[PDB]
Design an enzyme around this catalytic site. Sequence first.
Site, PDB file in Angstrom:
ATOM      1  N   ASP A 176      42.671  59.445 -97.288  1.00 54.00           N
ATOM      2  CA  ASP A 176      42.562  59.576 -95.838  1.00 54.00           C
ATOM      3  C   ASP A 176      42.354  58.165 -95.286  1.00 54.00           C
ATOM      4  O   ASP A 176      41.224  57.678 -95.209  1.00 54.00           O
ATOM      5  CB  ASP A 176      41.398  60.513 -95.500  1.00 54.00           C
ATOM      6  CG  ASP A 176      41.150  60.681 -93.987  1.00 54.00           C
ATOM      7  OD1 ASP A 176      41.668  59.877 -93.176  1.00 54.00           O
ATOM      8  OD2 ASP A 176      40.464  61.676 -93.605  1.00 54.00           O
ATOM      9  N   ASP A 217      34.926  65.354 -92.680  1.00 47.87           N
ATOM     10  CA  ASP A 217      34.790  66.442 -93.629  1.00 47.87           C
ATOM     11  C   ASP A 217      33.638  66.115 -94.563  1.00 47.87           C
ATOM     12  O   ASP A 217      32.981  65.079 -94.442  1.00 47.87           O
ATOM     13  CB  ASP A 217      36.103  66.729 -94.383  1.00 47.87           C
ATOM     14  CG  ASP A 217      36.533  65.603 -95.344  1.00 47.87           C
ATOM     15  OD1 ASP A 217      35.702  65.056 -96.089  1.00 47.87           O
ATOM     16  OD2 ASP A 217      37.738  65.297 -95.394  1.00 47.87           O
ATOM     17  N   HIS A 218      33.411  67.026 -95.508  1.00 44.86           N
ATOM     18  CA  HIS A 218      32.270  66.948 -96.413  1.00 44.86           C
ATOM     19  C   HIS A 218      32.209  65.625 -97.184  1.00 44.86           C
ATOM     20  O   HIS A 218      31.115  65.097 -97.425  1.00 44.86           O
ATOM     21  CB  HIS A 218      32.330  68.136 -97.376  1.00 44.86           C
ATOM     22  CG  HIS A 218      31.089  68.328 -98.181  1.00 44.86           C
ATOM     23  ND1 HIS A 218      29.935  68.860 -97.649  1.00 44.86           N
ATOM     24  CD2 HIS A 218      30.825  68.073 -99.482  1.00 44.86           C
ATOM     25  CE1 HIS A 218      29.008  68.913 -98.588  1.00 44.86           C
ATOM     26  NE2 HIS A 218      29.526  68.451 -99.713  1.00 44.86           N
ATOM     27  N   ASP A 256      33.120  71.973 -92.779  1.00 47.23           N
ATOM     28  CA  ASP A 256      33.545  70.614 -93.123  1.00 47.23           C
ATOM     29  C   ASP A 256      34.450  70.566 -94.352  1.00 47.23           C
ATOM     30  O   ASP A 256      34.640  69.485 -94.942  1.00 47.23           O
ATOM     31  CB  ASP A 256      32.323  69.708 -93.335  1.00 47.23           C
ATOM     32  CG  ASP A 256      31.519  70.072 -94.592  1.00 47.23           C
ATOM     33  OD1 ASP A 256      31.943  70.957 -95.383  1.00 47.23           O
ATOM     34  OD2 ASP A 256      30.442  69.461 -94.787  1.00 47.23           O
ATOM     35  N   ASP A 292      36.999  59.762-100.202  1.00 46.47           N
ATOM     36  CA  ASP A 292      38.351  60.217 -99.860  1.00 46.47           C
ATOM     37  C   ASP A 292      39.275  59.014 -99.646  1.00 46.47           C
ATOM     38  O   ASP A 292      39.495  58.542 -98.528  1.00 46.47           O
ATOM     39  CB  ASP A 292      38.294  61.100 -98.620  1.00 46.47           C
ATOM     40  CG  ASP A 292      39.605  61.817 -98.356  1.00 46.47           C
ATOM     41  OD1 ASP A 292      40.552  61.606 -99.160  1.00 46.47           O
ATOM     42  OD2 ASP A 292      39.670  62.598 -97.359  1.00 46.47           O
ATOM     43  N   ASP A 328      33.938  62.743 -96.292  1.00 45.75           N
ATOM     44  CA  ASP A 328      33.955  61.572 -95.425  1.00 45.75           C
ATOM     45  C   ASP A 328      32.564  60.963 -95.276  1.00 45.75           C
ATOM     46  O   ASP A 328      32.447  59.777 -94.943  1.00 45.75           O
ATOM     47  CB  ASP A 328      34.539  61.940 -94.059  1.00 45.75           C
ATOM     48  CG  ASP A 328      36.044  62.126 -94.093  1.00 45.75           C
ATOM     49  OD1 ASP A 328      36.713  61.567 -94.990  1.00 45.75           O
ATOM     50  OD2 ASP A 328      36.574  62.840 -93.217  1.00 45.75           O
ATOM     51  N   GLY A 360      44.051  66.139 -92.979  1.00 51.17           N
ATOM     52  CA  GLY A 360      43.169  65.084 -93.419  1.00 51.17           C
ATOM     53  C   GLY A 360      41.883  65.555 -94.057  1.00 51.17           C
ATOM     54  O   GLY A 360      41.161  64.725 -94.632  1.00 51.17           O
ATOM     55  N   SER A 415      24.904  66.687 -99.408  1.00 50.48           N
ATOM     56  CA  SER A 415      25.258  68.016 -99.928  1.00 50.48           C
ATOM     57  C   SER A 415      24.031  68.609-100.622  1.00 50.48           C
ATOM     58  O   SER A 415      22.927  68.552-100.048  1.00 50.48           O
ATOM     59  CB  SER A 415      26.498  67.849-100.801  1.00 50.48           C
ATOM     60  OG  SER A 415      27.094  69.104-101.091  1.00 50.48           O
TER      61      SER A 415
HETATM   62 CA   LIG Z   1      38.691  63.139 -94.847  1.00 55.55          CA
END
Ligand SMILES: [Ca+2]
Lengths: 381, 381, 382, 382
Positions: free
Chosen positions: C356, C345-346, C304, C353, C348, C280, C113
Amino acid sequence: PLNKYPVVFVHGFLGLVGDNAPALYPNYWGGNKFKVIEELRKQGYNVHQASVSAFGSNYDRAVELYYYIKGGRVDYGAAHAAKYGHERYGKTYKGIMPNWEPGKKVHLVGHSMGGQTIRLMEEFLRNGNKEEIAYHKAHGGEISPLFTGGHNNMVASITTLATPHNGSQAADKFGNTEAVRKIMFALNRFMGNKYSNIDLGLTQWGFKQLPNESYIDYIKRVSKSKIWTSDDNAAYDLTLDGSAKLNNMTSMNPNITYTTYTGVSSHTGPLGYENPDLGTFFLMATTSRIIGHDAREEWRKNDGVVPVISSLHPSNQPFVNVTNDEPATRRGIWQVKPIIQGWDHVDFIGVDFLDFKRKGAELANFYTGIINDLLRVEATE
Amino acid sequence: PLNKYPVVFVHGFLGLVGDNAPALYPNYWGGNKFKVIEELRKQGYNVHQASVSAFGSNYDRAVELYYYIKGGRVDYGAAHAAKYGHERYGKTYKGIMPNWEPGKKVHLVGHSMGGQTIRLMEEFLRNGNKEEIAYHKAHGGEISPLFTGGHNNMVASITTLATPHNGSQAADKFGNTEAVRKIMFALNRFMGNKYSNIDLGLTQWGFKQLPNESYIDYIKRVSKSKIWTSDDNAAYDLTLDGSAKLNNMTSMNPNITYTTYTGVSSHTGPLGYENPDLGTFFLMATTSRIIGHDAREEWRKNDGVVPVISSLHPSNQPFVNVTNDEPATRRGIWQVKPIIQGWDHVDFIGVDFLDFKRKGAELANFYTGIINDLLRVEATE
Amino acid sequence: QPLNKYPVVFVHGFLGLVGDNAPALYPNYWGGNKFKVIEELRKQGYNVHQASVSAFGSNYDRAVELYYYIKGGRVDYGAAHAAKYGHERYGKTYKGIMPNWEPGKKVHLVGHSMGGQTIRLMEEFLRNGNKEEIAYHKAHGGEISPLFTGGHNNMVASITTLATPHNGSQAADKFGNTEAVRKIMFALNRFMGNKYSNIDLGLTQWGFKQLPNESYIDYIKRVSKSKIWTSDDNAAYDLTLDGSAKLNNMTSMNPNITYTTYTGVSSHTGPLGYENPDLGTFFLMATTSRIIGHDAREEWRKNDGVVPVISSLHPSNQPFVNVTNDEPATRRGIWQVKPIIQGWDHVDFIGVDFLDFKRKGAELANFYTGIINDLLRVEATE
Amino acid sequence: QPLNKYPVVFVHGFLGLVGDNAPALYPNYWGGNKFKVIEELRKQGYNVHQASVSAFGSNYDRAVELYYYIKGGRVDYGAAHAAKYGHERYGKTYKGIMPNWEPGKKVHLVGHSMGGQTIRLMEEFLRNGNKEEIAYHKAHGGEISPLFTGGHNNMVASITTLATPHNGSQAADKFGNTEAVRKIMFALNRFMGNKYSNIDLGLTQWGFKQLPNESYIDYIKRVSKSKIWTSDDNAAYDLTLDGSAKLNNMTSMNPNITYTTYTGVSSHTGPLGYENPDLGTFFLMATTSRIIGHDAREEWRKNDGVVPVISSLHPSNQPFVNVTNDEPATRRGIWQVKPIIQGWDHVDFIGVDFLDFKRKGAELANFYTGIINDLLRVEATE
Ligand SMILES: [Ca+2]
Ligand SMILES: [Ca+2]
Ligand SMILES: [Ca+2]
Ligand SMILES: [Ca+2]
Ligand SMILES: [Zn+2]
Ligand SMILES: [Zn+2]
Ligand SMILES: [Zn+2]
Ligand SMILES: [Zn+2]
């Protein structure tokens, strides 16, 4: 029941009562020291604790107190709502006395800002609200009977406990400042969220998240509310100017019995300033020093957040000092009870769980003394 | 009101409703998805949510439910109180129907353990409690009418949502274990403290600190309570043995209409075991796997905490499967509604705020379907 | 003896807290419970580290701090920068993981990020200095940090960004950088500067440290005068499109550095052409994902959770080449864009997370093994 | 160059958490906000440190940890001790403040509360070893920690205890060591061993660390088999009268060490002869103070909140001499008992009582200046 008129206790600023308190939180009227509503009921008295806005203005709190007693849906007034920029209608209350009317009276006991709230509501009952009257004349519609005026013989007594009748420097120099008001309102926004069960008292300003509204849109929506810049909030009313506005629009009702109680919790330093006593509830240690270091000497002695010169009586209404055994049954004049030495602002309601000098038996006698005085008001009539 | 009999919704294990919920906490009946009590009232229906013990046994919860409806002070029975070692009297309830009696009926809807609680209370109304009857005969005194028996025509329908009629391995292997029960009871002890505003439901065991009792003596006092070793708690009743005791002492009332609903939220792995679906509420991910890896195949498919074989119906009472459009107006037999695919245990009450597949409109239709079925029970009589 | 000749330094993004600076209960930034990056890579024989820099500060303030995290010493933000934006010149003292860092001893930089942008800005400092600090030192004298002099090369072997908003994110323009949200962030920073607080949210150079004898009343009054409330020198602004573009317009390609980006996509085309978050997607990005996905320009919608795909692939007009996931990624001086990861996603990318269960730890372990194998190939081919 | 020739090591007591190991908001152990002992003593030119050892563990486990805090290395509790009480043999690895610690390089040891006992036990180890570990090594071989060998002297220059329950406290016998309270403490330790937790309460050698992939269900089941739930090898037992007496009966006087105790009194004689807590006793000790004050033996009632006066002055039958506060306290081999401080409760010694405005910081600064001046006089007179 041993009292012929119901007693209604009116909490002050920040107060949460009943099922509106958070999961772990001190019980407002008596703490764990004397459970006022519980015990006075056990003794055969008819008592109630009003639940009004904790952060709202005296105006908004006074309207809500009226509906707590009478029942119905809160109507802040169409003129007021339009002028300050918040909703006209609010909560709906079942009402402890549905048939409250001229003839059936209440005793009103208010702690801290509850005292100012009780004064402003009686004013509306007696003299009405001239803006709402002029509005209802010009635009028709409906007016709440609270703003009609002409109603008498509905309030038997008004009693105040550490009430800032003349304001407090702790509001001017701390609680009403920009940064601090932003903190208070951010707390209200957060307690408006869709998971929250407790009402902090500013939802008429928009601080209630809708169930399918993201917090991001909630922030965006309420950031446009007029509360952030308004004087229609409690922090303004507790300032010296705020309280003088209320003094300047209220008057003595010749038929009500008026009493004030005051604590002093400071001690004089070697220069004349006042510092909090030990056992002054620790959260008022700094506000106590702000008050105690005022440039005017007569504004320094304090209970932690209210200077003694503010608690004794409004500065423009007549008063008479009274001893602790003198019958306080005079009407139309503020009877100023002897300053209780060693009591800070919250020793009056028993929530200072850190002060082992202030025990339950002492608080039970205090509240039994108030009830006794009220019973003497009932008999001298 | 559009329904002639009041609907009473009965939360299950851990459930807190109304003003008994903590400050921030999901709303039990509908979450933020469909506010069941709010909306069904808006639609003209008379509905209520019972507030009964969150950790107490089915017996204790069944007694308290009766007083929630009828009103009065909870009487657990003198024989029961003596045998399990807890207080005989408990909370006092105002009561949603003071004149509840043979002739005025209620619909009962229970989620999870609320289903078992509804069954046990109707049993008391119909057949009484033989221990309390034998006790009141031998020692005189007073008996609650709940335990007298002979009362009929008071419950129109019993509906269960994901109710563990046959128990759950999540209780046997986790929730009823020593270490976990000690955690539950330690939470109850702490929520008994003198600052606490929320009732977790075991104060009849002594878990209420007195206002001038130190926590140190409170610990010492309640460590002697029989709760720590008792089976009179919810965790025991939710076990397979616990629920079979209830099945073995309840019977079908030929006049009541019985319905069950069941969710499945697991999927079959390559070996035959069941694993939680994604979107199964994350707090039941582990219990779902414990159930899903049972050694008996027919005990594996589950909603997160209740196996499907448990939710469909008690295993010793008669049943009939029913389609979703088939009128469920038969009396005296469990009508087993079609298993809802993709719903976990808490999708039934909308509190799974992390499952964006389960939306409000879907839940509103579900609760509108239950009300519709109940209205058909009322008309076929 | 370590298997990697140059230490790998992982650089967290916005809001990231690492190591001892995280709350008593708080997820572990680099890998969650799914693959403990530092722990597991050390167990395998690799020399890796977790930089700790300001969670809420600007890329500039973070890049300075990253340099002192590696080199050691007292943070020097620059007299010119401090006078321009109105915060302190000196910050914390770091122990330094490579006290000997100097031309010839390199590091591999891996940023998640905002970490991706911080890593870029620190290398610009080493190579080119900071023009405004150089000019300040020429005109007024005193000492100038060597970070700001320029001319310090052969210190960075690679730059790898994961879900980095090189081109900004509408989640900052339309939310994170708004007035109301900056006030919330700064209030959080005021509060965690209180005298009982053990965790550093990265803005104490603005005054957000309460003195031991100062009342909270007086703390509120002192920091309410701080220029932070109206300043652009903070993460929220740098994450906007304009903020990230300013960084793009003051960085340049180093021909000796190996550049690599990774990007996730977590949205799906809704009925009208807008993008909505996948089932998710970590739920804290559900609303930001929709804000990005409903942009008016179509190329800016895929995302994301918080970073649009077009922003993560590479800085807008800096040279790039798309690569497959298996070919050697040893080109120098050019952003090698790894294929977009579908379903990640961002967060993951960093395993935090826990809700998930579909993204398991073995897959996250393979992902970090891929990066280290790529880094080992940079070393082998110089 | 430091003004003290030997480093001063401050050793916290029971429940104490220091440095980075304390929750995100939590008081600072050594001095609160009233006098930041480490910070302020360093500013004055003194080399001082804050040991970090187990908050809930036994004096034995804490004494081992203290040695590795000073020396450096992997904690070795002893194969014999680990087999006897059923916990792990190895614990954490410390960086070590004096890696060179060895006969000839001394430390000054200053302990508050249980810290006073921990410091005594570690010196017993250095001088005399641990008989059971020596015998285990003779019979089975393997490696024996040098802490347990004995014969290591001239490493401790002074031992100073503040409000140390040398003779136990009824607050442990009648409350802290009870079944219900040990369960609460151990539950707290189970929970702060969970996989998201950053703070170490000192009992992970008993199993209270949740693995990254282990469910909480399975964690509860694994640690419920731990011997900690029924063991005496913990702080709660060691703080009882019997627990402290066992330490008294296995320690001895070192003729080269300078011993000094400080004691507070915070109670007043009630109407019957019992002692009740003073106004201003920190409220968390209000009930423990009354438990001590109502003892049946009169000499055991005066107390500071949690430690009776007779327990803090000196170990029961170890040699002692009462001193005035101003005379030189440079006698060796004997407990020099400083005059009882009137009005100081157990936590007034460490400044954490923020509610009590009567005990200001200047007075706490003078108190630590007195200790350091005494320590500097130990150094000057050898
Ligand atoms: Ca995720
Ligand atoms: Ca007080
Ligand atoms: Ca679900
Ligand atoms: Ca004290
Ligand atoms: Zn208003
Ligand atoms: Zn029971
Ligand atoms: Zn800056
Ligand atoms: Zn041990």
